[PDB]
Design a protein around this ligand. Structure first.
Ligand SMILES: N[C@@H](CC(=O)N1CCCCCN1C(=O)c1ccccc1)Cc1cc(F)c(F)cc1F
Ligand SMILES: N[C@@H](CC(=O)N1CCCCCN1C(=O)c1ccccc1)Cc1cc(F)c(F)cc1F
Lengths: 726, 728
């Protein structure tokens, strides 16, 4: 009777989720990439027009992987020769096409191996980074102006982030921010001169005779950190004369006293820029608000405008201090910050008034501020039904905080409990995106009335296909631990009979401020495990998890590898007694932080797990990068937290692996969690004589994401799970 | 009923083979280390005396791992702070103890981190190498004389070999040879300046924050090779004046025309040194014989004394040209070289007469020349019973080649078919060492009559223990392939019943000039597999194997990865039809070259094997070192042999692993077969989508020999074999 969602269905993508990625180019229209051609839509009525033909670039000779249309609509940026670097960085080649004259610009071309390119927010200026230096192009076909002269590979970074700032703070390679009307181009500069280098072999294609040694400036816990400087250049004064003058914005003095980080940059108006700085001990941050001094030429940040955000229970912000959203005139702003009760809510600030006023409150949290008009502030929160794993769009009346309206809650409560949104330029319209618990549903709305204009994509195609297959169901609920509730989720096999006993796989991540129990619909490896292998796949959010208040999130401050691993153990202990769970067949797996936790759990000696898999695990915190590790662990010095750094390694628990079956997997070219970390785990297991399974993936990084490696690791892990369970 | 030889018995060494390692210090006495104390024995009667007390070094503060007594008997060299490097090289600290005055010498001490130390053959001079430079000490307590000033880590090596000369040509770190009475100290110097570097990560103890990158000058196939120079210094002219004058011995011109290697140095008399040179294409070698010119001060090598040794079927020598054994006056010498029929035999040379005369002949081979007197030449060969896997000591009368006597053959034919020997200084006595098929047996003999003086060690202790356990048996036999015989051996489970069907594990190495089928008694992993798991463990010697003549050994010249892998397949195919072998459960494993072969066999598509294990395998020849690879494969250039270099990779056979269960294992710090090789195998397997098992050993090298790693790999492989055979 009917088939199931098989491993091959997962690996080969037989059932695909349709999306509807649009890009607003104004307050009334958006672009819609349609594989071949790019269309422009009228939000109000839904009528479209071909903006760019599929055939426009046949005889280009190069495969284009992406394109960027100037705010103007006058030019289009073509990206090709894409070569991936880290999680966000990459280099490519670029050609600009003039839509005014259907020509391909041929002069003063952007160099090959360009590191980053971006239009100004208005008109058609360009800033790009090449050989670590910043360049500006006022017109697509005119010579470009060199802004920085200090770029040097692996040493001086202008306009682009070094390894740790990319991964841990800006989640981007770009370190340059244009002012709203494009007059100013602000940028950061990173000096990695004394940052040690992580080195590892990269074998490359078979033809390479000698393996290459990759070296990337990467500061591990407690090591020397990159240093940073911020600058602002006026792109209307480049003219031709001499080298552009970049005005630096320094300090704050409370930051200069020791190591610190630049952690946010947000333009407030044409002449006001805000900056957030974080001390190396990340429980204290400062926001400066700097104004352009037309007579002086410099930028001054009035101490009256300085705001301090600190924490006494932990670090500041979910992963870094949140970003400010300024009102039109730039004299006030809204920002998500922790409550006195420990819940993240929106607080209203006057740029020159120290105390703010919360506009939202309650035991739930604002996930993020989505749009600000002079009337309303739109935000996403998990307030609805009191479930931390749901997401809904709300709007709050700026003149009366009592008038808060939920805009997504009731649209289709059965199928939609997790939304994200995308507003037009002046928030006249917004696209709601529901991604669970039912199939994704994309809709378009107009802010004046909040009425739904139409359904953009309802995934009906996928729906027809999935009713021919025995799909698994998902249960989102909670259990109680010491007077506080903790949520969990279970992917249940089809025709789940609580009478029968099922094996159970604990899918874990559990890093600080994470969430594995939610209402999102997913087609993944767990779908296959439940549907075909009839394995229940659970996830639990214990101490340390986020979106539930600092009492739960900061529970692991300076204590990684303790409560989050114990709560995973307690959850499974509780699941085993549920009645539909086979005690004798409970397993655990995780990737990255999940791998760390999975390994700490298997070596805890609990005896609750038969077997487990850890993919690219951290094994000891001194091996991970400073910005992340230190944020939760402090410095690994005897005066600070070295003792716990030493008490929380997977290696120290080697002996207890005797009791379980373990699968350790790691990519050899992992630039993030160095192969080193699993190399030390295997060496410790060998030293006490415990047998285990292993698999290395040659040249794969932290994502083990090449087509073949991805297929191979899941296939390998599937064999492992079925064997431990049958 | 009784126990078996278990995996734990192997990993924990519960049944140990006793040895009797002696060291001759004269023609009448030898030393015998007895854990605590070192004794000196009188060969004639067997009476001993305590030479050095166990307690002599209690308050030394350092654990001593070895010691060397000067030829004199006057001093003793103490080795401590031993830190291993490659297969033979290491650094250590040294202290000299004066036995004349029971004192520990405290002045002008040998440096810490010394790379190599050796007494002169006579008296008590010392030569040692430190920071790549040569030093000489005329007296243990006097300032030493710096001989070389060019040493530079990883670049210029004086008196010590670089990585490839250590592994492939001299099998030692030492590159210095004293003359017979210690007057001259000859040495080689290696320049690795343009040799590329192999680089790999070394993780070290957990406390290392950032992994270290090791880099060692290592020339892969076809790359730039180290260059070499030979020198001779007179240690009686060091006196104090100035820097010692080292006299260089160059050429031969037939060698200087291109890349070449220094491949042997053998002193002939107090003033005559011989040297063998090998061209980079290793089918041609030249021997120079150089005499000290007292008036000139230099060394001249008379072209009349030059001898060429070349091969048209393959390379020269088993692994390099063999070494000469000179007669008293140094005007003649005996050397093992290939026959016109292709068999290695002893031939007699006049230093200035071009054509030699073979003194042994037949379809068997002389393994090595063991001792030369004015009367007789003592040698080891596999002549007896026509079995290439046996070893016996023979003596041939130098005045009449017809009088050859076998000295070991009949001593104990049932238990002993594999001997090695150790002669005293002037061959007055010799120690025979039997290592199979029965338990090892060590005996002492006197050459005058060849009578047995006494049994030194008969392993009776082990014998008592082994009769309480169900030990396996060993069968040495042959099968015929295309009119020629090929030997094999099988470790058979106890109470073997040819009626029952047994799973069979093919244990393979099969590199050029190797031999896995022999009469040696062994206690290893195969003993456990047969005794406890009742698995038959076989080994076969096919084309390319040695000790059976060049027709078989050179069969793979320029053709690695072809006939030796095919013959392994044919052997297993034949074994599967034997009647006591289960077709459905045949597996294969090998280490190193064995790993390469095992992988080529599993990827051949034969279907004969269900599963197999490859430990530290070579995967493509361009990744291995020049001296070894090129010897059998030529240069990897289109004009030469690049096509076969490309046709013989494990990676190209990836698709055929779909049919088998494969276990790939490699040490991440393997400086010999770089992890790189298995990294390319796994990446090729992943690319065609074939599932397999893997295990990396952090910081372990080509031997995966630390105590814990050794135990862990055998345990892991045992689980894999039992599961593939459906036991447990
Ligand atoms: N440093 C972590 C950054 C991180 O958690 N990010 C990026 C910064 C914003 C916070 C959310 N997070 C996401 O980018 C993300 C990263 C990794 C898994 C899921 C989601 C990445 C990370 C943490 C670890 F504990 C690992 F071992 C591996 C890893 F990549
Ligand atoms: N290069 C080889 C040197 C070698 O065979 N030696 C050293 C030089 C004298 C000839 C005999 N041989 C011995 O040292 C020895 C080494 C290894 C196994 C058996 C015997 C070593 C070797 C060859 C390979 F094909 C491997 F992949 C690994 C390896 F160690």
């Amino acid at each position: 009777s009917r088939k199931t969602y098989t491993l091959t269905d997962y690996l080969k993508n037989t059932y695909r989720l349709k999306l509807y990625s649009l890009r607003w180019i104004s307050d009334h229209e958006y672009l819609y990439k349609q594989e071949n051609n790019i269309l422009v839509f009228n939000a109000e009525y839904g009528n479209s027009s071909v903006f760019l033909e599929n055939s426009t670039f046949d005889e280009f000779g190069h495969s284009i992987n992406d394109y960027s249309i100037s705010p103007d609509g006058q030019f289009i940026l073509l990206e090709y020769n894409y070569v991936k670097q880290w999680r966000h960085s990459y280099t490519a080649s670029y050609d600009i096409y003039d839509l005014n004259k259907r020509q391909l610009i041929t002069e003063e071309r952007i160099p090959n191996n360009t590191q980053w390119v971006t239009w100004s927010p208005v008109g058609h200026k360009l800033a790009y980074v090449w050989n670590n230096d910043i360049y500006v192009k006022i017109e697509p076909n005119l010579p470009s102006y060199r802004i920085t002269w200090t770029g040097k590979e692996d040493i001086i970074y202008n306009g682009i982030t070094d390894w740790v700032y990319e991964e841990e703070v800006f989640s981007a390679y770009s370190a340059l921010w244009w002012s709203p009307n494009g007059t100013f181009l602000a940028y950061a500069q990173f000096n990695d001169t004394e940052v040690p280098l992580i080195e590892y072999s990269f074998y490359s294609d078979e033809s390479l005779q000698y393996p290459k040694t990759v070296r990337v400036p990467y500061p591990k816990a407690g090591a020397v950190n990159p240093t940073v400087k911020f600058f602002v250049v006026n792109t209307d004064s480049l003219s031709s004369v001499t080298n552009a003058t970049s005005i630096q914005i320094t300090a704050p003095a409370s930051m200069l006293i020791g190591d610190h980080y630049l952690c946010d940059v947000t333009w407030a108006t044409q002449e006001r820029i805000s900056l957030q700085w974080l001390r190396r001990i990340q429980n204290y941050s400062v926001m400066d608000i700097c104004d352009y001094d037309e007579s002086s030429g410099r930028w001054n940040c009035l101490v009256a405008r300085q705001h301090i955000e600190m924490s006494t229970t932990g670090w500041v912000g979910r992963f870094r201090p949140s970003e400010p959203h300024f009102t039109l005139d730039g004299n006030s702003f809204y920002k998500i910050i922790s409550n006195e009760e420990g819940y993240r809510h929106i607080c209203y600030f006057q740029i020159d008034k120290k105390d703010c006023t919360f506009i939202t409150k309650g035991t739930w949290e604002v996930i993020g501020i989505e749009a600000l008009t002079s009337d309303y502030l739109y935000y996403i929160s998990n307030e609805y039904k009191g479930m931390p794993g749901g997401r809904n769009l709300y709007k709050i009346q700026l003149s009366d905080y009592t008038k808060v309206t939920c805009l997504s809650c009731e649209l289709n409560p059965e199928r939609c409990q997790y939304y994200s949104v995308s507003f037009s330029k002046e928030a006249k319209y917004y696209q709601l995106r529901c991604s669970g618990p039912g199939l994704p549903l994309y809709t378009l709305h107009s802010s004046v009335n909040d009425k739904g204009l139409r359904v953009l994509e309802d995934n009906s195609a996928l729906d027809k296909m999935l009713q021919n297959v025995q799909m698994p169901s998902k249960k989102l609920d909670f259990i109680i631990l010491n007077e506080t509730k903790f949520w969990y989720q279970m992917i249940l096999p089809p025709h789940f009979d609580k009478s029968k006993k099922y094996p159970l796989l604990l899918d874990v991540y559990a890093g600080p401020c994470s969430q594995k129990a939610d209402t999102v619909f997913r087609l993944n490896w767990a779908t296959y495990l439940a549907s075909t292998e009839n394995i229940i796949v659970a996830s639990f959010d214990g101490r340390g998890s986020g979106y539930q208040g600092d009492k739960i999130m900061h529970a692991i401050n300076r204590r990684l590898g303790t409560f989050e691993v114990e709560d995973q153990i307690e959850a499974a202990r509780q699941f085993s007694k549920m009645g539909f769970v086979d005690n004798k067949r409970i397993a655990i797996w995780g990737w990255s932080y999940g791998g760390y936790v999975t390994s700490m759990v298997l070596g805890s000696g609990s005896g609750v797990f038969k077997c487990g898999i850890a993919v690219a695990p951290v094994s000891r915190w001194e091996y991970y990068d400073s910005v992340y590790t230190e944020r939760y662990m402090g410095l690994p010095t005897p005066e600070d937290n070295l003792d716990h750094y030493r008490n929380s390694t997977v290696m120290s628990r080697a002996e207890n692996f005797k009791q379980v079956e373990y699968l350790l997997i790691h990519g050899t070219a992992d630039d993030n969690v160095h192969f080193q970390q699993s190399a030390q785990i295997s060496k410790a297991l060998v030293d006490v004589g415990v047998d285990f399974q292993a698999m290395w993936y040659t040249d794969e990084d932290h994502g083990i994401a090449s087509s073949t490696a991805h297929q191979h690791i899941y296939t390998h892990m599937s064999h492992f799970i079925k064997q431990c369970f049958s």
